[PDB]
Amino acid sequence: PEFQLQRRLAADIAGVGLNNIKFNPERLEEVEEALTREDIKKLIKERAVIVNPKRGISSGRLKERKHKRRSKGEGRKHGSRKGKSGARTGDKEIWINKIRKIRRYIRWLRDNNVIDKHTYRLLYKRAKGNYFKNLSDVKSYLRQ
Amino acid sequence: MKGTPSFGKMNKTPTHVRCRRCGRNSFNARKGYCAACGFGRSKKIRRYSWQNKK
Amino acid sequence: IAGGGFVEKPLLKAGNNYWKYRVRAVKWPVVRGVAMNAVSHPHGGGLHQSVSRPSTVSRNAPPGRKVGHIASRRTGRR
Amino acid sequence: SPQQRSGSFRKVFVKLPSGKSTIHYERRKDNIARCGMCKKPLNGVKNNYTYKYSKTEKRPERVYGGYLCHKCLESLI
Amino acid sequence: TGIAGRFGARYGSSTRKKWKEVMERRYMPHQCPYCKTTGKVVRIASGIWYCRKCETKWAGLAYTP
Amino acid sequence: KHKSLGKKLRLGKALKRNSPIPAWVIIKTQAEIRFNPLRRNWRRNNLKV
Amino acid sequence: MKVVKYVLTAKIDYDGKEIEIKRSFRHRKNIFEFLKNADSNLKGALSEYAKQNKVKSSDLPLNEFITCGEIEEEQGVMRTECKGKEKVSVKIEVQTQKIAK
Amino acid sequence: IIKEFLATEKAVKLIESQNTLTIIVNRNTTKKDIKNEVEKLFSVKVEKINTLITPKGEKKAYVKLKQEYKASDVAHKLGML
Amino acid sequence: GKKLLQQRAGRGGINFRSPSWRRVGPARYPNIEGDHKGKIIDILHNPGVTAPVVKVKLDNGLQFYIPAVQGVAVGQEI
RNA sequence: GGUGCAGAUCCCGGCGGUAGUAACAGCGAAGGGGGGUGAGAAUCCCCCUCGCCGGAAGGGCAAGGGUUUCCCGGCAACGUUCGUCAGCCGGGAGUUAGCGUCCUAAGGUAGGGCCUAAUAGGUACCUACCGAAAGGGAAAGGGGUUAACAUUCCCCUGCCUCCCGGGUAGGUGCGGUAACGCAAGCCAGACUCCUGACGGAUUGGGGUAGGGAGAGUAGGACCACCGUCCUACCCAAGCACUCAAGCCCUUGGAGAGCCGUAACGGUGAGAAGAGGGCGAAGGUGUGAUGGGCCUUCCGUUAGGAGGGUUCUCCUGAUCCCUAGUCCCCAUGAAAAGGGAGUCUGGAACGAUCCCGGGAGACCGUACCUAGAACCGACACUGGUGCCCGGGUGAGAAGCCCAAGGCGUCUGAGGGGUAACCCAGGCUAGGGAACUCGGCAAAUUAGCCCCGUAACUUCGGGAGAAGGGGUGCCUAUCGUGGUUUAACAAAGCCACGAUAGGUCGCAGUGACCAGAGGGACCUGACUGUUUAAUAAAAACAUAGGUCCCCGCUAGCCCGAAAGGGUGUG
RNA sequence: AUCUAGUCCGGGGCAGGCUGAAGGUGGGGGAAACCCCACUGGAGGGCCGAAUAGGGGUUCUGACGUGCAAUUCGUUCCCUUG
């Protein structure tokens, strides 16, 4: 009266875990005489071998939450952060992005004749010198 | 530790295996010698005056 | 031969000393004997750490016993 | 079989329309073949983990083309 | 004291000061005897030096060219 | 198993037969309850290679 | 068996000769990065054309090819143009055919 | 030299499914050809063979036949079917 | 009692040999009989040496190693 | 004459009492209901539900055990209970490779020789060989099929090595000035060269797994009212093409400065800018009108017939390749195996090209990797491993829940539950009076900002000290990244600030999470050690100091050959 | 010498953060000697920290002490790029 055979076999034929497999509480009599992988395959279509669909983590809440998180500054305040200052945001990365964006801007300015050579170099040296802080701030300086 | 764990690491290969001659799993691979069947450095069979108590 | 000023830079660290001889057969780190058990050193043993015998010995001294000041011409800092 | 170095830890799911994801092992890279006298980083010779029997394609048509550039070579002819 | 402290407050300043003075001479800009002082030379190891222009390996001292 | 065919290559008195007594032989002997005393088991023993 | 496929037939227009190539796609993402630069793609496609049957020096010595136009669709038909410097241009035409049984 | 024709429930399918034969030979521990043995004993061409070392002490070989030779016939000639 | 630490080095065990395979080679003067001219081709570090060495090609086609001497470079001729 | 027994903590065998007593608790699991089987069911089976684990109780991989794997039938013991059940017993079956074997380091051996009286002794020399299932080392994957193993069997795509058959570049070719590009002869060499082949730190770019977002397509759950969530939406190798750094090729000619970086830097020795070449990962086609994925319906023995399996975007690896740069009194293995270059001789036929054909020993191949498969005498909280989802959250921290697994870390049921013990929680008021000793236990604790003494080796001390804010929601704004994207808009996405309103005792609400300060002694510190009574002031240390010694030295070891500090 | 001691050879690992020496660059103070500030830079037998990431075994002389076991278990510590 032990027939793990059927229970074990179904998991392989469906690629799911054993515990996620169920039989008909009725059709035990017509499932015992299964002896082959052929038989389990034939029986699964006949709905004797009911296969449990994979469940999942419902995620509607976090969809609302993240959207709540993102747009309106919800919970992001500095009074709710476990890590240290730079932990969330690597300042080195910011400087990398900062130094990058200003450079390619003035390149585009030179190759489009926005400014001259001597203007460029003085602008460039300042960038390495941390003279500016922002794309808007640096671009504002151009009109003096 | 000196107690049971000292026996723990003891799953590796036997430092004495089946020497082909005397049917005793007593061939020290590590020493390139059998301490039982004598094969390895004596052409003659290892035999002693005191195989037992006299 | 190159290597001038070789020892001017301090080792500053037993780690350096450890990797200075990592390949040379010098036994490292060197262990003094006067604190060792007498079972394995001529000057070993004793609660009060002291020089057991005048370290200077005669030239005919047997091997394994010649220790410390060996055939010293003179001692002292000066 | 124990976690080793012989094979770059690759997987398969980009160029892929069926549904199945697994792992593969593949041996390490080569470089331009070995020895050293001019220690010059060579060029223009093919070196793949398989060899397509391409005769000249793996060697320049220069006089010492597969051998080395003209930096350290005028000691022979 | 600059480079003298890159180990913190350890091992003794007097030791540090000795290690200090010699170290700068390694990093004090030198003059390549072969190409020129144009580029700077580096000390791969005691006696090993070449700048990145001459490509001329030569024998140096433990810490000086 | 990467057994280097020195123990599995040899089969029989080495790596074989902790076997049960033949049935019909028991009928012949008429013995009370026939055994091989040489009976061993993997969990309680350590075969001497 | 796969379903739905995008067939692209690009008519190459250089000096005198008209060249057309056949090559399709599988996900509707392939198109855009195919035309991301396409200079490697097209020249190789041309080199394939020379490789597949015959002839050399068709439009190989083409210099840096200036991208293309902008891809357009009206009856869901992806269309655009790609010209290069002078005397070198290629057309773009895309079909979306259902494979079916 | 051939010794027996194994007849496990596994084997019976193979002679039908793939027209192979499960035959176990001496442990000669040297083979280039278990192949040319069969035809001088059964007049059958060979397509492939392989190596098995059972823990009971025998040496099994999966030998399969080209389609022109239905392995079930010779077995029936032998007489297990 | 049990022999000295210095005593232990007398056995010539592993704890006292050098991994000279990690070393470049035996740097002694190769035997020559007359007068010959050589050029330096490389300088390498040798671990248990505390002094750099040189690889020098011989005009007759020989490989050898000598302790490196101050103020000498690759490509110079000796 | 082995000779008369109560002992000798005698020996051996049997059985007493303590006695149905201890234990079958303690390391965070837990079952319940209904049905079935069978004599017999808390324990076995079927269904549903539920709890727990969930950087491990999951997944895959060794040495070892050796059938522990599977099928069929059983329960006297074997199982800490029982037992219809099992790794247990009984009856049968079950591992396939043209996609370890080879070479070599530590070393080792065997021989020739140097000693030993001899040797199964040592052996510096020479020779030959052994020495890795994580070193190197020719070449395949995908799907598909049995209860049992599979890159091995069935199909397709291949692929490598060698050997034949035919033509083909070749021996008598080629473009450009070049960087180089390619169907380049052949076989005997000989020599030489060129990855294989080697460390750490740090950083960028480019990739890829895994993931999310939205619409759409089919199914299920959903429901007091809402309509939301999950489900599947995707395919390798080989083959064709492809590029980002770097490094090279022409042209070009610049500084009182230019080029360029994340940074360092580059620049007249040719920078800038133009043209180019060699050229990773990957990616894209093909393979792939075959399967795979879900699913509808009819059939319901036997099968049969359809549907779709899309589109647009985002983050993103500790998984790759690709680069720079720093460090060293540490400079970070060698062979075999490959490939190429050059010169000699040979014959004229003749391929490193493609096309067709043929072949490719032998052996490893089951299972388990450990709270039951290994060892520790056991179905043992000990050790021995190794490698690898979401949210919350810096996180592989804790929590919970995905995948999967489990209710066998194997005895259970009754009860208003006495004392007591071990794990805890909480105690008014006083707050070290207990006490050798504040031991224990408590208090603080995340984060941001402000603010921070004496002293000193000037480097720290230093989260010194101390103070202030921290939630929820309605809005915003700034910054930056990203998509063919200078900027800027659009969608996304992360981060950082502002305003306002508002709730509670509590706003790092749990979880996670320093008490601190002052005086003095000792040890300079990190480190190491008394496995199974001791971690320290005990040892090592960086440094000063002295001694010996010019290689046939000095030092030390053996009988001797000599050995090692000595590739000095 | 499968344990432990040591060495050699070949291999496998250390989630995340913090701190910020040298050097580089730009401001600013004065002709100077050079000094202050900002950033960049990423050195260290440095620091915090993952029960079982890994190591050791510190107090509880905490339970067991005819064991989970002829040396543990739970608490409770220090180390973690050398």
UniProtKB/Swiss-Prot annotation, chain A:
Gene3D superfamilies the UniProt entry points to: 1.10.1200.240, 1.10.1650.10
* Gene Ontology biological process: translation
GO cellular component terms listed in the entry, alphabetical order: cytosolic large ribosomal subunit
The protein's matches in PROSITE patterns, at most eight in alphabetical order, are given as: RIBOSOMAL_L19E
**A Pfam family for this UniProt protein?**
Ribosomal_L19e_C
SUPFAM superfamilies xrefs: Ribosomal protein L19 (L19e)
GO MF term (any one): large ribosomal subunit rRNA binding
Region (Disordered) residue ranges read 55-89
Q: Which InterPro entries match?
A: 60S_ribosomal_eL19_sf (IPR035970), Ribosomal_eL19 (IPR039547), Ribosomal_eL19_arc (IPR033936), Ribosomal_eL19_CS (IPR023638), Ribosomal_eL19_dom (IPR000196), Ribosomal_eL19_dom1 (IPR015972)
Family per similarity comment: Belongs to the eukaryotic ribosomal protein eL19 family.
Protein task: Binds to the 23S rRNA.
Would you tell me the protein name for this molecule? Large ribosomal subunit protein eL19
Q: Which organism is it from?
A: Sulfolobus acidocaldarius (strain ATCC 33909 / DSM 639 / JCM 8929 / NBRC 15157 / NCIMB 11770)
Swiss-Prot record, chain D:
- What do the Gene Ontology cellular component annotations say? ribonucleoprotein complex; ribosome
Transmembrane as a keyword?
no
Checking InterPro entries in the record gives: Ribosomal_eL34, Ribosomal_eL34_C_sf, Ribosomal_eL34_CS, Ribosomal_L34e_arc-type
Any one Pfam family match given in the protein's UniProt record, by short name: Ribosomal_L34e
Domain of life the protein comes from: Archaea
One of the protein's GO biological processes: translation
Keyword list, A-Z:
Ribonucleoprotein, Ribosomal protein
Gene Ontology MF annotations: structural constituent of ribosome
The family line of this record is:
Belongs to the eukaryotic ribosomal protein eL34 family.
Q: Could you tell me which HAMAP family the record lists for this protein?
A: Ribosomal_eL34
Q: What is this protein called?
A: Large ribosomal subunit protein eL34
Swiss-Prot record, chain H:
Q: Which HAMAP family does its entry note?
A: Ribosomal_uL23_A
Q: Does the keyword Transport apply?
A: no
Q: Where is the signal peptide?
A: none
Briefly state the protein's biological role: Binds to 23S rRNA. One of the proteins that surrounds the polypeptide exit tunnel on the outside of the ribosome.
Extract the GO molecular function terms from the UniProt entry. rRNA binding; structural constituent of ribosome
Q: Which family does it belong to?
A: Belongs to the universal ribosomal protein uL23 family.
What is one GO cellular-component annotation here? ribonucleoprotein complex
Which SUPFAM superfamilies did the record assign?
Answer: Ribosomal proteins S24e, L23 and L15e (SSF54189)
Subunit-level organization: Part of the 50S ribosomal subunit. Contacts protein L29.
Q: Which NCBIfam families match?
A: PRK14548.1, uL23_arch
Q: Which Pfam families does this entry report, sorted A to Z? A: Ribosomal_L23 (PF00276)
Protein name (record): Large ribosomal subunit protein uL23
- Which Cys residues form disulphide pairs? none
Give a GO biological-process term.
translation
The UniProt keywords, alphabetically, are: Ribonucleoprotein, Ribosomal protein, RNA-binding, rRNA-binding
From Swiss-Prot, chain I:
**Superkingdom of origin:** Archaea
Q: Belongs to which family?
A: Belongs to the universal ribosomal protein uL2 family.
Q: What does this protein do?
A: One of the primary rRNA binding proteins. Required for association of the 30S and 50S subunits to form the 70S ribosome, for tRNA binding and peptide bond formation. It has been suggested to have peptidyltransferase activity; this is somewhat controversial. Makes several contacts with the 16S rRNA in the 70S ribosome.
According to the record's subunit comment, the protein's assembly and interactions are: Part of the 50S ribosomal subunit. Forms a bridge to the 30S subunit in the 70S ribosome.
* Name of the protein in question: Large ribosomal subunit protein uL2
This chain's source organism reads: Sulfolobus acidocaldarius (strain ATCC 33909 / DSM 639 / JCM 8929 / NBRC 15157 / NCIMB 11770)
Task: State the covered range within the intact protein.
Answer: 2 to 79 of 238
